[PDB]
Structure formats: structure tokens, C-alpha cells
């Protein structure tokens, strides 16, 4: 089916109507999404099938048809854009300065924007258009506001 | 049985909506990939 570079919706017919369970990135013929979106299941694209190749529950990442390809990193300074793909709504660039998750193993960039769970896997871009990670693994705080890690995999 | 549908090109858009804060949060990551607020 469709192997074009770009941002995709992930849909299921297992719930009422057609439901958006999340989002991901097609790059160099590999599909990149968050583990909790697909739970590692196979994906249809046309009558095309995409089979899982790599995944890790702790990182909450999964690749299809090939190894993880996205290797760019937040610089720690600059503003970024979330390419939000909300359920039933057009793709929309939202520009923000990331904060930080401080962890016992080091610091990760964090994006503080409130979208529903089905936006999980929307890509986070630098100014060269490179994907520096995926949005949708994080924390709910105080009033019900969402803060997502900038979740990036490793290229070999 | 899940299927994918193309939603857009991956491009930086000059003059996009600008919003959100930049909190510094202490967090833990468990074996299940769950982030938790330490403080
Ligand atoms: C290792 N697991 C913990 C991964 C995991 C992740 C999710 C998705 N979580 C999520 C993602 C987004 Cl983009 C938003 C929200 C949210 O609650 N947003 C609002 C605005 C606060 C209310 O709509 C939640 C689900 C189950 C899972 O196991």
C-alpha cells in the first residue's frame, strides 16, 4: 500500500465506528509509533500489511518493516513543533519550548500541550523538519493538564 | 485489525500557533514504561 514519507493516523474498527487509537511516522519505508498504540499488532495500509520489526515496552516505541530510523535530538535550547494529528481533525503544527523530565538516569525534553489519547505518536520536529521524537508518553498533573516526554529511539 | 491513513507532510510551518509552558518535573519511569510524578 502506502510507503510515502509523512505522518499517519492509526485507526481501528474494533470499537464503535472507526476509532483513532493514535499516530505515527513513515520514513525510509519504516513505520514508527508508540507501543501502547498498536500493542505490537500488524497494520493494514491498503491491502498492504505492515509487520512489526522492533519494539520495547519500557521505551514505549515500535517500528514496522524495518529498524528504527529517526535519530535527531532536541538541542535543549530551541522551540520545537508538535505536528498534532487529533482524532477527526486536520494535522496542525503547534509551536512550544519544551520543559524537562528530571530522572535518576538523566534528563529528557517534555512537551506541555493537552490533546486526547488518540493523538499518541504525533511527531515532534526541529527547525530542519527532522523528527526528534514522538508525543504521547507522559504524566497528567494538577487540573488535568498533560506533559509528554520527547520519546526518541536509537538508529544502528 | 488496525489500518493507517496519511495525515500530512512532516514540515516546520513558519507562523504556527505558539502555546504551552515548559515545566521542569522530577519523574520516575517503571518497567511498564509508566512515568510517575516524584514532585
Ligand atoms: C506505558 N504506558 C503508560 C503508555 C500508555 C500511554 C497512554 C496514552 N496516554 C495519553 C496520551 C496523550 Cl497524547 C494524552 C493523554 C491525556 O490524558 N490527555 C488529557 C488531555 C489529559 C485528557 O484527554 C494520555 C495510554 C496507556 C498507556 O499504557
Which CATH number applies to A6-64? 2.40.10.120
Identical fold, A6-64 and A80-149: yes
**Contact predicate A109/A100, CB 8 Å:** yes
CB B16 within 8 Å of CB A95: yes
How, if at all, do strands A92-96 and B2-8 pair?
A: unpaired
C-alpha–C-alpha distance, residues A17 and A30, integer Å: 28
Phi and psi at residue A118, to the nearest 5°: -60, -10
State the burial class of residue A88 (Cβ atoms within 10 Å of its Cβ: 0-12, 13-18, 19+).
exposed
Query: Which positions of A are catalytic?
Result: 36, 60, 120
Beta carbons of A91 and B33 less than 8 Å apart: no
What per-residue string of b and e applies to A6-18 under the rule 16 or more CB within 10 Å gives b? bbbbbbbeeeeee
The C-alpha cell at A4 is 510515502
- CATH number for region A80-149: 2.40.10.10
CB contact under 8 A, B2 and A21: yes
Structural domain boundaries of chain A? 6-64, 80-149
3-state SS of chain A: helix, strand, coil percent to 5? Answer: 5, 50, 45
The approach used to solve this structure was X-ray
Chain B partners within 8 Å of A42 (Cβ): 1-2
Among A83, A67, A78, A95, which residue's Cα sits nearest to residue A133? A83
Amino acid at each position: 500500500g502506502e510507503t510515502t514519507d509523512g505522518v499517519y493516523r492509526v485507526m481501528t474498527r474494533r470499537l464503535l465506528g472507526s476509532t483513532q487509537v493514535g499516530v505515527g511516522v513513515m520514513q525510509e519505508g519504516v513505520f514508527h509509533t508508540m507501543w501502547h498504540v498498536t500493542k505490537g499488532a500488524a497494520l493494514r495500509s491498503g491491502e498492504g500489511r505492515l509487520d512489526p520489526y522492533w519494539g520495547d515496552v519500557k521505551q514505549d516505541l515500535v517500528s514496522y518493516c524495518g529498524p528504527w530510523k529517526l535519530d535527531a535530538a532536541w538541542d535543549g535550547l530551541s522551540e520545537v513543533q508538535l505536528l498534532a494529528v487529533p482524532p477527526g481533525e486536520r494535522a496542525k503544527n503547534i509551536q512550544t519550548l519544551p520543559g524537562i523530565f528530571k530522572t535518576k538516569d538523566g534528563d529528557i525534553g517534555a512537551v506541555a500541550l493537552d490533546y486526547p489519547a488518540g493523538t499518541s505518536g504525533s511527531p515532534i520536529l526541529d527547525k530542519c523538519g527532522r523528527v526528534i521524537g514522538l508525543y504521547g508518553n507522559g504524566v497528567v498533573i494538577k487540573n488535568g493538564s498533560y506533559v509528554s516526554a520527547i520519546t526518541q529511539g536509537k538508529r544502528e | 485489525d488496525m489500518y493507517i491513513e496519511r495525515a500530512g507532510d512532516i514540515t516546520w510551518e513558519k507562523d504556527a500557533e505558539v502555546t504551552g509552558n515548559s515545566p521542569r518535573l522530577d519523574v520516575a519511569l517503571d518497567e511498564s514504561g509508566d512515568f510517575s510524578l516524584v514532585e
